[PDB]
């Protein structure tokens, strides 16, 4: 869901790219307009968004489709940021790896009470590359999935 204000702003930007007024823009214009609004998807993310929202695959998208993608890109951008912030919290020394000690130092300060063996298990399962710690990627793997 978008607020009244965001929809009006998005409509103004969309109309700027819809010079002919036929109510649609090309998928190329889509990326350009999204970037002007502060959304920076990778080629892959953009294309998957397109194929997923634009079921006809004909190279043009309309205003409501555009709103739906701006909504999705905003949700995704907020999640990612929420996760990064969450990461910086666990990773106390900011060296890019969450150690067992740091996971503990957090469950404690949080209020959660867990036996060290259990603190170690969260790490063990999150730890994918087997270095005994959780890097950023292994972290987002636990958060998203």
Q: Which residues are annotated as a binding site?
A: 18, 20, 22, 24, 29, 54, 56, 58, 60, 65, 91, 93, 95, 97, 102, 127, 129, 131, 133, 138
Q: What is the largest CA-CA distance in the chain?
A: 65
CA distance 25 to 96: 41
Looking at 2-10, 37-45, 46-54, 112-120, which segment touches Ca ion (CB under 5 A)? 46-54
CA distance 86 to 143: 10
Lay out the site mask for Ca ion across 64-103 (x = CB under 5 A, - = otherwise).
---------------------------x-x-x-x------
Nearer to Ca ion, 77 or 126 (CB): 126
Q: Which of 10, 18, 39, 123 binds Ca ion (CB under 5 A)?
A: 18
**Chain centroid to CA 60:** 25
Burial profile 77-92: b = 16 or more Cβ within 10 angstroms, e = fewer: eeeeeebeeebeebbe
Q: Which of 54, 66, 70, 119 binds Ca ion (CB under 5 A)?
A: 54
Binding annotation for Ca(2+): 18, 20, 22, 24, 29, 54, 56, 58, 60, 65, 91, 93, 95, 97, 102, 127, 129, 131, 133, 138
Residues with Cβ within 8 Å of 101's Cβ and at least 6 positions away in sequence, in order, are none
């Amino acid at each position: 869901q978008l607020t009244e204000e965001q929809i009006a702003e998005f409509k103004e930007a969309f109309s700027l790219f819809d010079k002919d007024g036929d109510g649609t823009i090309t998928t190329k214009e889509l990326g350009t307009v999204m970037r002007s609004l502060g959304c920076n998807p990778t080629e892959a993310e953009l294309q998957d968004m397109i194929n997923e929202v634009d079921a006809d695959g004909n190279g043009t998208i309309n205003f409501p489709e555009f709103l739906t993608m701006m909504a999705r890109c905003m949700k995704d951008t907020d999640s990612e940021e929420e996760i990064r912030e969450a990461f910086r919290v666990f990773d106390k020394d900011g060296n890019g790896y969450i150690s067992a000690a740091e996971l503990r130092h957090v469950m404690t300060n949080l209020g959660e009470k867990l036996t060290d063996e259990e603190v170690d298990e969260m790490i063990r399962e999150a730890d994918i590359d087997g270095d005994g710690q959780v890097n950023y990627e292994e972290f987002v793997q636990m958060m998203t999935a």
